[PDB]
Every structure is written in C-alpha cells, then in structure tokens.
C-alpha cells in the first residue's frame, strides 16, 4: 500500500570538493554522495497514473537551481524595483553537472518505464527507485540541451494540446548537435553551427508527429511573435557567458516542405551575440556582468528537445502554427522529471 504524497527531497551528486567550478561547489555542501549500488525493482502487475504537469519534484528542482545561480552567478550590478545593488563580479568556472533527486525514509519514487509514455495518464511497466537519474540543470530557452532522449518515438508532451496557453515539449528521438563559438573586432559576436542536413530530417519527422495530433492540418513554424531577447532567441549559458542565438533559420519552412531544395542540406550558421545585460529568469530584474573572457569560447551541445507554443484563435484553417519557446524554466526540469513521482509507504 502507498499513496501520492509530497515531501522535501534531498539531492545526491559526484561533485568534487576540491574543484572551483560553481556547480561542484554548490553540490558539495548541498547534496550527498551517490549510491554506488542503487536498487530498482519492477512492480509486477501494477498500473500507476503519472502527471508530469503537476509534479512537486519540478518545483523543488527549480528552487535548487535558483539557489545555485544566486550563490554562484554574482553580477557586478543587479537592478530590481528602484534598487541598485552593486557587488564584486569576478569571472567564474561554469559547467553543469548531473544532480540526483532522492526520497527520504517513509517515501519512495515511482518510475514509468513505458517507452512511449507521454507524461500523463496510466503507465503499465513501473518500477521503484531511491533516486532519479542524474539531471544536468541546463538553463536554456527554445531548445532543450544535453537532456536525455525519447526512447522509441518522438514524443509530444503537453498538459492539453487543445489549450494554447500550455507549453508543448517535443522530445527528440535522436539528438542534433549545435556548435557555438565566440572565436579568438567585436568581443560579443559569436555563431552556432548545426548540421543542416540532420536537423531538417528530424524537424520534418516532428511536423509529422504533430500532424498526428492535429488531424493532418498543415503544420507551420514561425519565429516568436515578440518578447524579451531571452525568448525571441535561443538563450543559454556557456562557460559563464550568456549567449543569444537567432533561430530564424532553424524554423525555415522552405526546407520542411520536403522539397528537394538547395542548401537545405549542409551546415547552418546561426548568428549569436554574447550579452552582459540580461533579464533574469529567476526573479524579476536585470543583471549586468563583466565583458567576455578571451580565447576561443566553445560549447558543443546536444539538442534533445524543443519547446513550442501554438498560435491561438482564428483558425478557419487548414493549418496550425507553432513558434519556438514556451512556458518557463521549470519546463526544462519537467522534461527530465516526467517519468517520476513520489509516493509514501504505509
């Protein structure tokens, strides 16, 4: 016997106490060591309901990641309200590492193992674990990076596809790499390279998946309709520097129409900018950091998911229009914690 419950979790990690990189520092005094011999066992003849869209584990991970960045990303200036906060702002070492979320005594986590699970509803093949797998807390917009991959098919996740105020998480089958560099002029100009060939192939099989869920209406992609640069652009942090990359070429219907068309294959160069004045995702305000370091600043990452928002209203179509980005940062964790839920033993 057990029941859905919520409780304060602890985290587990392999952070090096000697290292200076900020994730290792936070985890060293905030988490405990991983269990080397972790036991998980199938729950024979059991069917459980999961709901990735209402899962307190997500709120808990968010509170930690917010806590990490506050402790670790010290801006020279922080602007909020009519307050101007000025501290010391030295360059840091920044590379996310896997954190495990674990239950205390009396409780336990349930894991859905259906390869096709979409985040909500019954799950057949279930097991139980002390801790989740290791989740890199990668903060990004539009694209999900360095996450885990959908097991069998590409998987569309939403709390309600018919509700245009609800985020769509596309979970990729296979991953497409993006190669961002700020070469060793303009110290903030950068660019991201993507194998144009593989991305269109994938993106096309995404449109087909969406056609499945939207009754074969024409599926169209468009750039965001507005908002702060943090959402109109693929926004992420690399080596402690804040990148903003124009994804307009990534949502380029020309190559999605399947038309055997020229330069659809071959490398795609997204122009990026490194900014020092950023609008914080955690809390309401602006943060100003010092200019970028020198040398070749290079983060190669895996695209493993896509966040979409669907245009509301009107119809009288014919088609359905999707734009990159959606939701909030909690959605990034949600996309990794989707197969887990905490229950209490009695």
């Amino acid at each position: 016997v057990w029941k859905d419950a919520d409780t304060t979790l602890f985290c587990a990690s392999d952070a090096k106490a000697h290292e200076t990189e900020v994730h290792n520092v936070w985890a060293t005094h905030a988490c405990v060591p991983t269990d080397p011999n972790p036991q998980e066992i199938h729950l024979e003849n059991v069917t459980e309901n999961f709901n990735m869209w209402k899962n307190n584990m997500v709120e808990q991970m968010q509170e930690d990641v917010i806590s990490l960045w506050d402790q670790s990303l010290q801006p020279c200036v922080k602007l909020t309200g009519g307050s101007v906060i000025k501290q010391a702002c030295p360059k840091i070492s920044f590379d996310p590492i896997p954190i495990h979320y674990c239950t205390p005594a009396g409780y336990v986590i349930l894991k859905c193992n259906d390869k096709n699970f979409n985040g909500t509803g019954p799950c057949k093949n279930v097991s139980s674990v002390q801790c989740t797998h290791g989740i890199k807390p990668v903060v990004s917009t539009q694209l999900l990076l360095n996450g885990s991959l959908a097991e069998e098919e590409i998987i569309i996740r939403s709390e309600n596809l018919t509700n245009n105020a609800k985020t769509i998480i596309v979970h990729l089958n296979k991953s497409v790499e993006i190669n961002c560099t700020r070469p060793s002029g303009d110290i903030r100009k950068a660019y991201c390279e993507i194998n144009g060939t593989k991305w269109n192939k994938v993106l096309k099989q995404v449109t087909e998946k969406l056609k499945e869920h939207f009754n074969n209406k024409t599926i169209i992609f468009q750039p965001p309709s507005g908002g702060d640069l943090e959402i109109t652009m693929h926004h992420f942090n690399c080596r402690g520097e804040f990148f903003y990359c124009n994804t307009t070429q990534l949502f380029n219907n020309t190559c999605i129409g399947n038309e055997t068309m020229k330069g659809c294959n071959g490398t795609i160069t997204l122009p990026c900018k490194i900014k020092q004045i950023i609008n914080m995702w955690q809390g309401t305000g602006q943060a100003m950091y010092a200019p970028p370091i020198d040398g070749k600043i290079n983060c190669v990452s895996n695209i493993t998911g896509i966040l979409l928002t669907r245009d509301g209203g009107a119809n009288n179509t014919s088609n359905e229009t999707f734009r990159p980005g959606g939701g909030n940062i909690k959605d990034n964790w949600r996309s990794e914690l989707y197969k887990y839920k905490v229950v209490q033993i009695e």
Partner: antibody, heavy 122, light 99 residues
Framework: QVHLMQSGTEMKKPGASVRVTCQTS????????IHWLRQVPGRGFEWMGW????????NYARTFQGRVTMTRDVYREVAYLDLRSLTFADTAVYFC???????????????WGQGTRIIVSS | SALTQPPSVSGSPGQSITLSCTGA???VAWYQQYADKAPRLIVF???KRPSDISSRFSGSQSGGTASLTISGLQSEDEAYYHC?????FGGGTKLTVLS
C-alpha cells in the same frame, strides 16, 4: 483586491495607431498572463491575444498578427496593447483580463478592466 | 460566434430560466455583463460557483453542451450573459426580465 485600470477613450483616424494601457494592482504582476479582448457593444467578445509578463512572451490571434503588439513594464506593473493600421472595423470597447487565482485553468476571467472605447473615424 | 448562444431570452420575476451555450471544446465559464459595464465571472469550469456569487446561479455542462440556470429571477438579473471555452466566446445572450 485585484484591480485592472485602463486608459481613457481614444478617438483615432483611419491608418493611425492607438495604445491602450492597463495598470495592474493588488497582486504579483509577473505571476499571471494578461489577455486582451474586444467587443462591439451588444455583441460578443473577441479574444486578441495573451501576454506573459515574465519575459514578455505573447500569443496573438491570427486575425491581429502583424498589426498588434502586447508589451509590459514589469516594474510599474502595466500591460500595454498597441494596434496599428486602424479601420472603422476596429471601433469597439477593449478590455484587459486576468484569470482566477491558482486555478491552473487559464481561461476563467475573474478580473477585467473597465473597458476602453476606441472610435475610428475620419 | 464560435460558441452558440441565443441572442435574446425572456423570463418572469420569481421563476427559473436556463441560458444555453453550445459548441464548447472544454468546460465553460460564464459571465454576467450589464450594458457599458465590465463582465463578471458567475461560474467557472462548467459548474463551479465563485464564493461571492449568488446561489441563484448554477452551471451544468455535458460535453460541448453548457447551461446556466438562474432561479428566483429579479429585474437586477437583466443583462448580457457570455460563456467561453478557451479563447472562444459565444455571441452573448440578452436576458430580459418582464417587469
């Protein structure tokens, strides 16, 4: 108590643009979307779009796409609606609205501004 | 006119009456609107009533068919009534109360 307080009546000429302001108060502005709708008196509401004040994300009705923008001022706690290329077809009362607390339902509009009359005439 | 509502409906003081809203793709919300005034939410999620709304008002909905029942009608109930499901609204119903 939550209050949505809109700017006054605008009389505009065809081809012009108008901005309507919606001053928020009584709650944490960043925690809720602001929607805009319009209505010809005696008729039904027409939804125009939503705006998420966090990072300013917006979702506009296909009808208004390219003619509308919804912005905000996170500190002063105000949402703006801008509409351009006005026509007599845009004469109406314009409202901002906000959902009920907590619900998770996004479309239950407990809170409305008082409405702003926009009159388009040459 | 995504959702379907009769444009006009009339009732007598003291009796019940049920306004209808058809075509909904989810559970509906209902609003009362006086002329030249702002709407106010009278039921949400098809049949839920906000704590401050009079018990004379009640909602019921099956699939896309939604209904709003007002009992013990009063002249003060004369207004437009609207319903939405997501971003889709009805055309509004003007309720008259024959005074």
């Amino acid at each position: 108590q939550v209050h949505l307080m809109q700017s006054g009546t605008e009389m505009k000429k065809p081809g012009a643009s108008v901005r309507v302001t919606c001053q928020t108060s009584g709650y944490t502005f960043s925690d809720y979307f602001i929607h805009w709708l319009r209505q010809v008196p005696g008729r039904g509401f027409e939804w125009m779009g939503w705006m998420n004040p966090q990072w300013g994300q917006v979702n506009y009705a296909r009808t208004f796409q390219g003619r509308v923008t919804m912005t905000r001022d996170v500190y002063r706690e105000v949402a703006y609606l801008d509409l351009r290329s006005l026509t007599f077809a845009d004469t109406a009362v314009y409202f901002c609205a906000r959902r009920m607390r907590s619900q998770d339902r996004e479309w239950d509009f407990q809170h409305w501004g008082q409405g702003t009359r926009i009159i388009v005439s040459s | 006119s995504a959702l379907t509502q009769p444009p006009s409906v009339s009732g007598s003081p003291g009796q019940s009456i049920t306004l209808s809203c058809t075509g909904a793709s989810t559970s509906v919300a209902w609003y009362q609107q006086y002329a030249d005034k702002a709407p106010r939410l009278i039921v949400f999620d098809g049949n839920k009533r906000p704590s401050d709304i009079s018990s004379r008002f009640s909602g019921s909905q099956s699939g896309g068919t939604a209904s709003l029942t007002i009992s013990g009608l009063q002249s003060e109930d004369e207004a437009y009534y609207h319903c939405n499901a997501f971003e889709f609204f009805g055309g509004g119903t003007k309720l008259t109360v024959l005074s």
